[PDB]
Design a protein around this ligand. Structure first.
Ligand SMILES: CCn1c(=O)c(=O)n(CC)c2cc(N3CCCCC3)c(NC(=O)CN3CCN(C)CC3)cc21
Length: 114
């Protein structure tokens, strides 16, 4: 965390865009609609989605890379937890984990250069 804030935020914005690009159906773009799943919060302690991540970023809630990555990992893990393995949603979370992990490793390399 020994670096300047502004270049770090620029990197997080770019990284978040790269992660969202992997979600081609935009199914992780907004909060899971709780009005449609009244049991969702019985299973999921902390819902997450890319719009919430963007709000958190601009509110200065991500001041280290690990906190940003942790919220991305919640998007994936919540979806794996709630949805059955035979669903497209579950498989899309697996694919996002794979593609997004690669985006995150490269972004972390860039953060280390700061
Ligand atoms: C099962 C709970 N659920 C998850 O657990 C989850 O991880 N995601 C993230 C992959 C979910 C994502 C959505 N979408 C919200 C609308 C955009 C498409 C994805 C919904 N939508 C609905 O429950 C209602 N939605 C059914 C499809 N119809 C075309 C429109 C009305 C539930 C999700």
């Amino acid at each position: 965390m020994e670096m300047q804030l502004t270049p770090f935020l620029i990197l997080l914005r770019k990284t978040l865009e790269q992660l969202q690009e992997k979600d081609t159906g935009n199914i992780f773009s907004e909060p899971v609609p709780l009005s449609e799943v009244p049991d969702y919060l019985d299973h999921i302690k902390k819902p997450m989605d890319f719009f919430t991540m963007k709000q958190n970023l601009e509110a200065y809630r991500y001041l280290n890379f690990d906190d940003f990555e942790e919220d991305f990992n919640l998007i994936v893990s919540n979806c794996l937890k709630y949805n059955a393995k035979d669903t497209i949603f579950y498989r899309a979370a697996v694919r996002l984990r794979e593609q997004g992990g690669a985006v995150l490793r490269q972004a972390r390399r860039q953060a280390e250069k700061m």
